[model samples]
Target: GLAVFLPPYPFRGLKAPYLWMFYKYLHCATDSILFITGEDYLSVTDAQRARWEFDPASMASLGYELPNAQSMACHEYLTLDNAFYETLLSRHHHDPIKSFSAFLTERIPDLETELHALLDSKKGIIDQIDTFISICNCPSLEHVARTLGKEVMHIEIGPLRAPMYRNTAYLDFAGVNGGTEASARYEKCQAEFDIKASLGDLHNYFLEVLPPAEAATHSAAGVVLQVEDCSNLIAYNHDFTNISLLSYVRQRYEKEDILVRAHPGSLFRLRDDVFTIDDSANSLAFINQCNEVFTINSSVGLEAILTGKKTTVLGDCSYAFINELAGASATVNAAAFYLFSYLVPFDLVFNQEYLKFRLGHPEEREIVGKHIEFYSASLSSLINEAISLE
Candidate 1:
């Protein structure tokens, strides 16, 4: 079987083409496609459903001689609806555990035993990846995972609503979920991003489901800022913080004030209830509208660059060096005015240099695979050793 994993990046949308590509490859190669995500959910698409397992067109084209991709139903449905399976037609609902049940229930009719055994094997693979990422970190994580003989793929993340924290790697970046493969493959930043996917047809999604009944519910100034209120920074008194560093830039905006968008999970670390924004705020839409962007070593930093906004990183993040358009600001004392003067020209930095450099670069590619090979072999050895004992 073939499987692709993603973490930190939301794979449900943009990565559709690649996922389809993988499924097609597996079909011709005589293997089933297995997608394992590190997030709390699992999702499959309508296109995938149509093309995979039961492609009528392919059958007609091939005169029914080609082997059809078979989806095994190994268990019961995990949820009440298609939350487990993300449909392009109905792109909003997602609740993984329940949908996992759906995948099993629907497929188990034909290949229950194989499906069950594969599930156990996939779980074992996840366990191995998790253990590996914990030992290494980003730069080394991808590199090491590659040496192990498996291609370490980046897992895609979400289509979360606004005010739910659109930026920050701690949430949408890095391998935050412990048991997932993300935690293992990305212990350190890598030189290549093997898997890239965006949520599909965001324009349609916004029209149907985004808050305020319109995408205009974003900050008035069009200056979206994604920030984190991590205790690690709070303890440092904001002196060495990337947030504080980026916040310093916001203070310099003469015509428009930068709108601070908080992470959805920030409440867990936020010190006071008074720090919250108005209920209408939507971080995703805010980022979508921003004239210029600033973030502290967060996923938004990379995102700002991706979307052609001027991004400044205040701390060490995995994506920092990969993009030349992105600039780094070392955290310092309460000397906000001085720092702003040095870094305030957002457009010049982004257009002329940062984005120019980051657009088509390689990163974390081999590292992820190397680590996967190492861990996979290690696990194989352990399993084989047990057999030898018997």
Candidate 2:
């Protein structure tokens, strides 16, 4: 099986720790794994390994030998055994999907020729895979995965990957079998299911996971959230979104009572002494400390509502559904629906029993809590060691 294509950024947050363990998990679950790349896979691996901080001791504790990604590659294995590797390299379509990246002003000017050449080179491997697991998809791979008729899992960050909710929300997946979440019926239960009870269950769940810290009184009347330009630009279509958020916050609140948070993406982005910057590794803890919470469109806004703050959206947000859910038993109801019904949890991805039920049929939503209660442990402890990588 092939690991979906990847960016060369050093993994942190979702990088090394997560991916290292993800690959290890797949290798244990399956017999082996193959990586796809053009000529640059080795160079890409080198750059990534140089900056990657996975500890040797950590792997030792797991009883695994340190991974040397270069040797782990299928390059020599395929070339020696089948000679397919040498033949494919001759196609010269071996470039990673990164060549088409616009970030560096690179372009695949002759997109069609490149597509065929790319396919012609990988057709042999694609034919061998029974399952294709990928994160973000590019046109080249997306076309192959979608058009070639194979089982695909479109994986990405889910809605509740918060520190407090990490144990339950850490999915290696999201959309059902490569289609969007609309691929399922969670929406039907949005109204049909009892939001009040789910809300209570949700609150109780978090209470057990990470009890809300008792916050000290703040002189500030509001907390303004900031996101890094990297994500903000893409999410807002590269608009003057920061300007609008600053203007909106300043106009609505007194300067003395508003504290803007540090850029979650960078403590380095803004080193200004002009305004006090609040920063923390635990956002829900930060949210609990605030009087009111505001953001352009960060998920922190939704977390703001769940933590019971007077949450405000200063710009366009995908979770705008949180806004309408602001009335009677409202925020809590939204929290319940979002965490339980709307978002797909990690268990469904790990348990196979869960994903098995959704493999072919996505027209109907997987019944809410169907195989859920294991009475309490499908995602049990292999995961305890798997994700927390301690």
Candidate 3:
């Protein structure tokens, strides 16, 4: 039997209609059940449950119609559960850089070897699996599939920039971590936006959505240092290779009115300065006052773009393309410039048709349908080739 393992899809409150279609498509094409696994297997305290929008067991009831959550409890019942997999995918973020290193050197390889051993066991307990599929490129999952010699496929939604204009999902078979295939796909779909028009829309959004700025008390006259999640993979890999980011920002806005807004779950703290550390509950309010936004690889830069403010970066990020679009003239170290150029591009043409589709236009629904059709066929072809190989 073929089985598709899905990771926890969080409800960010954005109604994603394409999500349901992707699941239904998989169910029909594979003739097998889609097993919702991963995070649902973990225990949750009352505090954690309070943050959840819906019960973990009834996640399918949110917006999609799917079967009950498959209890990975089967492995626990069979005493096949182990700590190795748990440690690799654990959410307890301590020192992510250190943990990520340990995962690469130790955890992933261990699970791969262990899963291979299980598959070869004489008990025939695990022999039912012919094909294993996943929704995204998880390091642990990828390792196990390769080791067990099973066909696996990875699917992810569209890039954050375009976000697929329609309710349908934009699927990707390309590996995560912005691999070559993923990069190429993004380049193809990264249409440009109307600079002047989008900026106008952004300005209106800021004024309407955010609270009135305390511009009188704390003048919104200069640069805003937008902090990123320092513990995230992006920052761990690229944020502090050469320069201390805090120091650079402090120097850059030495005489200007600098306002700092730390990212959620970030450990950034300010000690001493006349420059304000934004204590506002809503970040958009603070962002509304800034003329420029700066970050390493924070998504806030993307928000800043949507809010019609200039954004500058000193590290790798998905929105480095904005720098070129803004015709940036700031100076940075040679290393920073090299990584920036290597990681981002400037040729994204504004995607009017796609943008219109995202705003709930009926005519562009086929655009999403066509995208799903293409990927569904691509996935089926891959599955067939994989089955034939054996």
Candidate 4:
């Protein structure tokens, strides 16, 4: 008989109560068995019910009666042991995660192919760029500028001296004229830039031309923090003060020597003390530098393993169990991490799995996601909206 293995559900972190209802029905309908996957979600909360988009006043707002952990384990074994699910998960397991992601992720493979082809052709692509830049009409750029002026928001257009109005944002001459020799046109752009030719000139152009000091809201000391997507909000269902994959580890050791990387636009009404960094900075850099990497749900934490960093996960990410890191826990806490810190080679956190999972492996493809595209689109719009302001 066909059985479905639900990726660990009833996760306390899941703010959506309706999804739990759906999961319950699916579990019972599909032979009431599943691969109780992630180890997180051991706790449920009151605000969580409201977050699930259910009426808080409703009596049914109580989350699915907390199931015994053992029962879930039994149920998962029953479902996962079935012939169909076993074969399906096993077959799909290692084919490279690129095969199936949400719709937004599906476009990446085609983009990679085009990039490789462009690089391999050895065909002069730069000449085409210069030609387009040289003969470009300012009309289109003007139209784009005018269209952007309609939005009302905070804005800035740096020092409005009229002579600096070269349509340098982009020019078609490079594309249309340069053809294969695109390097010449790019050099032209560098020459035209508002910088000096030598190091002294360069220093003057940047440090001298730019505005004076802007103070920071927090210390510049970089810390390891979790920045999740807007879609997967971070509301873990644990009783602990701090909620993270390493919560178990922390609880086991009662250690709070960690801090979460704050999401820039998070709606959570958290206290102001939490530090925030430019979300654009490399997350892996922070992870590698941190004493320990901790996350509830993020692929970067998995990437940290490759760089020789110990990682503790608060949620059920697929990579959690497979790799060998010195100090690792899923859906556990800081104490557990502290406890395991002694048992495992805490230094070997970034180990062989990094080589296997990322190096010359068949299944790695990088693509921009919805929230990432959000940054690019919003940044340009912000610039456009500010073009008129002093």
Name the candidate that leads on lDDT: 2
Alpha-carbon error at 12 in model 1, in Å?
30
- CA lDDT of every candidate: 0.32, 0.46, 0.39, 0.28
What does the lDDT come to for candidate 1? 0.32
Query: Candidate 1 on 125-159: residue-level lDDT in tens?
Result: 43333212111122233433344443333222222
Residues 1-390 of candidate 2: C-alpha lDDT, one tens digit per residue? 444443333212332323543444343443345443333333334545553334564444332344466435433212111133233333436432222223112222343244345445655765665555544433444455556775555554554554455433322233321223431333454454334343334544543365466777563444544644333333342243554666677787777666666555553444556555566566666676778876766657766776566777655444555565647465554455455444555444444445445555443223334423331461222222222331
Candidate 4 on 1-390: residue-level lDDT in tens?
111212332222342213343233332332332222233233343335444323432224322233455445444221111233233334546322212222111223333333234323444332222111111112222232233331111111111111211101111111211121223322332222221122222112212133223223322122333433221222221212234443444454333343345543343433545433334344533443455565554545544443345565555323344233334222122212111111112111112231122222121011112112222232222222222221
lDDT (Cα, 0-100) at 136 in candidate 4: 13
What is the TM-score of each predicted model, taking all chains together? 0.30, 0.65, 0.51, 0.24
Best by TM-score: 2
**lDDT sort, best first:** 2, 3, 1, 4
Q: Evaluate model 4: give its TM-score.
A: 0.24
Query: Is candidate 2 or 3 superior in TM-score?
Result: 2
Candidate 1 total steric clashes: 65
Q: Candidate 4, 23: how far from true, in Å?
A: 30
Query: How do the residues 1-390 of candidate 3 rate in per-residue lDDT, one tens digit apiece?
Result: 444554332222222212332334332332333343433334332234433333543333223233234422223111123355345446435444444344323435555565455455535534656555444444665667666665554333322322111111222233422231323433433342112222333233213233354455543333334333222233223545312555666676664567776654444555557557677655566666777776665545545565556676655443454455433222121112121111221111012223223223232224324333333332223223222331
**Candidate 4, backbone clash total:** 54
